[model samples]
Target: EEQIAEFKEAFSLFDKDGDGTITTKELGTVMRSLGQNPTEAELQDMINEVDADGNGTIDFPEFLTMMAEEEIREAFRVFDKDGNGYISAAELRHVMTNLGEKLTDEEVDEMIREADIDGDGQVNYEEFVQMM
Candidate 1:
């Protein structure tokens, strides 16, 4: 609700040629401005991650999703230790423990249940986004 307007403003400035593409050059503007310092090829790969049609460039809604992914993807990777596309109660326990703490399975379940939209025992990518 809050970020799209600001994101659109940023995107507007980035879409310089006016075809509505979030291209490699624009991605570098955002990344290097934020201190990422990546190469052009790598920047292309990063944009490709959210390129909805695999077109080597991202459109508006795709860029919007990229904004959210930029917010969540890194933290989500930390939780999904097994890289199985979801965070389990056990994985949450491990992450929490590594943070100099621990949680009982009961507590973990309560937290998991908070974001477990499908009543599944784990938090999948969609659930993780909502949780964020």
Candidate 2:
């Protein structure tokens, strides 16, 4: 499907090394740029859910599959609200809050700083997509 292709292309932009696996540290660095410096525990939990083989890392294909999963798509949609083709940090927190994982003020601020790639006070579609 076109949607799936778009997701895969978006993911490829994040898997920079092309090694098929994305480490918590790597994801942390990426998310940190977006303002979501996930704690180790949080990253581990994310890996556990996506790493179908329990290999402690996520392969590109695995990540693609994960993205295609219904629940994950729903989760991503929160950030993509308005179907405007992008996700801002505020939009991301809005999604988290909708999922009952409201972030603290500090966390919110951090997210804004890290995720706002353009430093324009918001994340555009390209920035959000490449941030993975």
Candidate 3:
């Protein structure tokens, strides 16, 4: 994804040794250079996502997963009504119907229209959304 491409690029800059992994020391030093003090624990926090085996560092795979994880989580948790572990247009419609005051017909129409987009074309999506 275009978003993850940027995150990978960001991590590469932080990995000064070209090992392509972010260590707590690197993140801490980077933050300090930028005039902020991030605790070792906070640097550890950012890396914890990719350190599944507890190596205490962040590789591209782990960093990308962390970036994408939050987004994928929002889509399901809010829309997966009844907690049955499912995703479908029907459930979205059902949820939409239940929130009357929260949704105007025009707003609902806009949401439905956004669903029509397949998310394939990058700039097209951003341009249209900004226009809206």
Candidate 4:
């Protein structure tokens, strides 16, 4: 229940217009501000994966379900073990390991490089959010 509220707050941050639905453009704008500016292609792919209704947008419930998907939620749980609401590279690796995902340090580094828009070397909640 607490997690649901947290997810709602997080989702609202990206929704932007109070419209109750988040579009790819809105999400992309948020990601750009977070330093992980995803390409439109990447954003589209993410939307496709999460938008179960094929409506080309994600509502709160759908967004929450997307976040709770096995791969994503497990990863987030592992990284957020300290409950700080963000993930460091070490945290990412640790979570991946716990999820039975074997990733070399270089592989992790590459993913960071690919995802880190600001080149800050650390992925914050907003950046992680876009990865979904």
TM-scores for candidates 1 onward, in order? 0.45, 0.47, 0.44, 0.51
Better of 1 and 3 by lDDT: 1
| Residue 55, model 2: Cα distance from true site in angstroms | 0.9
Question: Highest TM-score: which candidate?
Answer: 4
Each model's C-alpha lDDT? Answer: 0.79, 0.67, 0.59, 0.75
Clashing pairs in 4: 35-117
Supply candidate 4's per-residue lDDT for 102: 83
Between candidates 1 and 3, name the one with more favorable TM-score: 1
lDDT of 3 by residue, 19-123 (tens): 877888887866654435678878787767668667888777766667543554544554555555543455455554533225655665555456445543211
Q: For model 3, how many clashes?
A: 0
* Alpha-carbon runs more than 4 Å astray in model 1: 1-71
In angstroms, give how far residue 64 of model 2 lies from its true place: 2.2
Pull out the clashing pairs in model 1: none
> How close to the true structure is residue 130 of candidate 1, measured as C-alpha lDDT?
91
Q: Can you write out model 4's per-residue Cα lDDT over 1-132, one digit (the tens) per residue?
A: 888988988787788787998899988976654435479999989889789989999998788887545676655654655667666677767766644468999999987776676678877666776777
* Candidate 4, residue 48: how far the Cα is off, in Å: 0.7
Candidate 3 TM-score, true structure as reference: 0.44
Cα lDDT tens digits for candidate 1, 11-48? 77667566989788877865543424689989888787
Error of 4 at 104 (Å): 43
